[PDB]
Amino acid sequence: TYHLDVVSAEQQMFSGLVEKIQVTGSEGELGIYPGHAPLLTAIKPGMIRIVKQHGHEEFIYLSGGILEVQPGNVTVLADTAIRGQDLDEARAMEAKRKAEE
Amino acid sequence: QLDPLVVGQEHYDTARGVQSILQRYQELKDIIAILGMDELSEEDKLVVARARKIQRFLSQPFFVAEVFTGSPGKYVSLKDTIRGFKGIMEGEYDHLPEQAFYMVGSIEEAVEKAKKL
Amino acid sequence: QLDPLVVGQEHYDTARGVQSILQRYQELKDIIAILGMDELSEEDKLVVARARKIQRFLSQPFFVAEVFTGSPGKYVSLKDTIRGFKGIMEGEYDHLPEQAFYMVGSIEEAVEKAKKL
Amino acid sequence: TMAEKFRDEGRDVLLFVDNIYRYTLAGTEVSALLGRMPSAVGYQPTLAEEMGVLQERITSTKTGSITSVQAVYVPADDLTDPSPATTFAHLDATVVLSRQIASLGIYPAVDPLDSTSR
Amino acid sequence: AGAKDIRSKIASVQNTQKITKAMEMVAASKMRKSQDRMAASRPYAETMRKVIGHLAHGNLEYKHPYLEDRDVKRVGYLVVSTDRGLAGGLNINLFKKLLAEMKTWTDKGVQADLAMIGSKGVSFFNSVGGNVVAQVTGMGDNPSLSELIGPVKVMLQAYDEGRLDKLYIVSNKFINTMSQVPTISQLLPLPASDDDDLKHKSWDYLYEPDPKALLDTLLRRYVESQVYQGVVENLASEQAARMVAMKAATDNGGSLIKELQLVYNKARQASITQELTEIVSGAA
Amino acid sequence: IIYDDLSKQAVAYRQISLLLRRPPGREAFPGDVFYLHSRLLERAARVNAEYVEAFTKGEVKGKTGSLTALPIIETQAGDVSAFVP
Amino acid sequence: TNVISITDGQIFLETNLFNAGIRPAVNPGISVSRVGGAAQTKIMKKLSGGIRTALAQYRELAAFSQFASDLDDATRKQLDHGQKVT
């Protein structure tokens, strides 16, 4: 089994040792079995499926973020809110509006 | 004569309610100078709002004092002034600016003054 | 004798400027006592810095106090003192430290003493 | 005077005075009844003398001694008032008893930080 | 003056002193909660820096605008300030340190540029006239990263658009429960933190879709992470500064009670003596 | 026993005492104003059964008598440092 | 206290106002005329009523909002009229 940590900048969502997971990557679905290959990718917003060691299956919603893998240690760097270049550009304009005031 | 029996509960509980608010305001008022309203709490902010507007609604223009003031004198009946103070006590019509409670006399004229400004 | 007609406007205006600043510093001492200086407004800190410099520049060495101070005494002409106080109030000396103004005859001597720290 | 007898027999004696403030006030009331002009904060003019007449008899002699323990009340909590100010000229030690130390259950309830002796 | 009003002042100051003692106790407790929230912010940034180190310092090193080094022709600062007073000099000391460096670069002809967190720094730099393009205010004691995204997106946007060449964050550091210090640290271009390894050979990542887009998202998320860490440390530094300020206020209030009571008692005694002199001298 | 205003007894005693030219003391109250209220209130007592039996010449034997007193005082502005309070 | 009781009004002159430049140092808040506007020309009567009441209440706002170190829009407008009439 592998040590998984799901974290965000404000709080650490989940951690522990895990038998496997299913995750929606940027390009498609991915399953992390024991000792999976090294990996880096962005992950899409939605539920991800955890099966903790001793088989305790669970759902975690994530608003997105980055996945990394290496055989002994794996982590997900989750975002808190839906991230979009257009939405962030809208926030950037919003930020300027305050400056004028 | 401010006895529950004679004045009836209507008047007595209204009066004691006003008195209890205005004492709470006086306790806050000193440390408000140190804290502003910034470090005061939300429980305080409603009470001070009610207290100041109640303390404005206690003012009245007098037929004698029109000489000093130019505004006509007002007369207000007992039932009406109970209805107005209980109206801020329960109705809590903080919709209206603080000067809308001041020197108006009746409850109807207080809302009408806010309707005008 | 402190009248515009008797002493002229520049003297009168400098004396009222010194009083106005020093009174305003007294008004700030109660908040400074309770909360200290960091809670003052950003120009209230400037008033306090000018008032303390004015307080120290009123001090002077006396020729009869050499038995006490040991410092040599000083005589300051009227024209020279009003120029000094006017210059502090305009802030042309606002970069010297307080200690530079203590026991100096004329403003020159304060800038010279600030060179010696 | 009873303690003076036990001293003259050669013993060391304790004299407890249940309130020294009430001696001072009894001297004020009598002085007012006699009609003498008041002094200080309305006390009698003889205040320091009448305290001295009591306190100077309480001493160690070459035959024996009288030690005294005197309860003190301070008017208005004011240690500047003439009755406290006159009494404290004569005290050597000062024992303070505390409600807090009693609350801890510690007995005797002496306060070690405000109790003092010269 | 008048002992009945002096006694009124004494009661007012005594009431004031109790409330400041209460505020000291609360500020210490909030400092504790905000330093727990501080530790939770470390792991995300630490592991993201290890991944950035693996790509950047491995053999598969790339060129990217945030990794490349250039001469400063305009400069940016993110600046964190409180929304609340009573913090003592925490804001002012930080703003003085900022004003020195902002002066030093602009003497080199560099136009400075500012983004403000918290309304105190907004009000100060509006009075100073500093060049502010973005702000967020009223986060209070509950900061969130999703509020910070606006002003950092503006500064990031100006950095890769070449309108900024170095970007700092300006913040206090919660070095201790007892002590804190104002700091200015460069977050872009990326600092050359050594982060040296060879274990990248042994597990090397499958870049999906592509390496460069992933690296840009890591750099952007990393900057957001460092800004949020700075904000949470400055919030814990505020609570510790308010705690020590309220301690000093409570002691200065008690020390003023002991002076007003000497004035009151002296006026009490004098009023008794004068009235009884008028009575006794009034008869006969 | 309830004395509705011991403050108004001290004031009445002050009046009548000054009209008899007796020397004044603090707040113009006469010198013996403590002895006025002291001898009043120390009559409020519980007395043991041997006092009652001796007083009543044995007509009552087991009981203890008492008189409890609730004097009222009025302070000005909450000042308790005034002479009579 | 006797002459205050006899007279029809009071002009109070204060040294804290006289020392802060406010000469003549009449304190608006504690000074009163018991005849008031009935002794004014009617033009002055209009203008006078606004001025006295605005000054005395401005005094409360200035103390309150300085130590609070605070702003609100109508209060700000009121305060910098009150300073300008002062």
mmCIF file of C-alpha atoms in Angstrom, chain F residues 30-65:
data_model
loop_
_atom_site.group_PDB
_atom_site.id
_atom_site.type_symbol
_atom_site.label_atom_id
_atom_site.label_comp_id
_atom_site.label_asym_id
_atom_site.label_seq_id
_atom_site.Cartn_x
_atom_site.Cartn_y
_atom_site.Cartn_z
ATOM 1 C CA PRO F 30 -22.650 67.100 67.267
ATOM 2 C CA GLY F 31 -19.822 65.195 68.891
ATOM 3 C CA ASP F 32 -22.059 62.392 70.263
ATOM 4 C CA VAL F 33 -23.817 61.451 66.991
ATOM 5 C CA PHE F 34 -22.120 58.048 67.058
ATOM 6 C CA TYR F 35 -23.462 57.470 70.576
ATOM 7 C CA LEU F 36 -26.944 58.276 69.247
ATOM 8 C CA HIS F 37 -27.101 55.420 66.728
ATOM 9 C CA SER F 38 -24.846 53.143 68.772
ATOM 10 C CA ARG F 39 -27.066 53.049 71.838
ATOM 11 C CA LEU F 40 -30.122 52.700 69.615
ATOM 12 C CA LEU F 41 -28.920 49.705 67.599
ATOM 13 C CA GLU F 42 -27.170 47.766 70.364
ATOM 14 C CA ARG F 43 -30.558 47.288 71.982
ATOM 15 C CA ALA F 44 -31.271 44.866 69.117
ATOM 16 C CA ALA F 45 -30.161 41.602 70.702
ATOM 17 C CA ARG F 46 -30.883 37.962 71.396
ATOM 18 C CA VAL F 47 -31.167 37.285 75.137
ATOM 19 C CA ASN F 48 -30.618 33.885 76.714
ATOM 20 C CA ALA F 49 -33.251 32.004 78.715
ATOM 21 C CA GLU F 50 -31.695 32.926 82.073
ATOM 22 C CA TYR F 51 -32.115 36.627 81.356
ATOM 23 C CA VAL F 52 -35.771 36.103 80.366
ATOM 24 C CA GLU F 53 -36.507 34.035 83.464
ATOM 25 C CA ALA F 54 -34.833 36.610 85.721
ATOM 26 C CA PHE F 55 -36.639 39.525 84.059
ATOM 27 C CA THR F 56 -40.119 37.971 84.000
ATOM 28 C CA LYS F 57 -39.786 36.442 87.512
ATOM 29 C CA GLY F 58 -40.163 32.862 86.269
ATOM 30 C CA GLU F 59 -43.440 33.294 84.426
ATOM 31 C CA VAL F 60 -41.489 32.206 81.316
ATOM 32 C CA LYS F 61 -38.536 29.846 81.565
ATOM 33 C CA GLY F 62 -37.404 27.982 78.435
ATOM 34 C CA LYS F 63 -37.553 30.659 75.731
ATOM 35 C CA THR F 64 -34.904 33.049 74.414
ATOM 36 C CA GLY F 65 -36.169 36.440 73.272
#
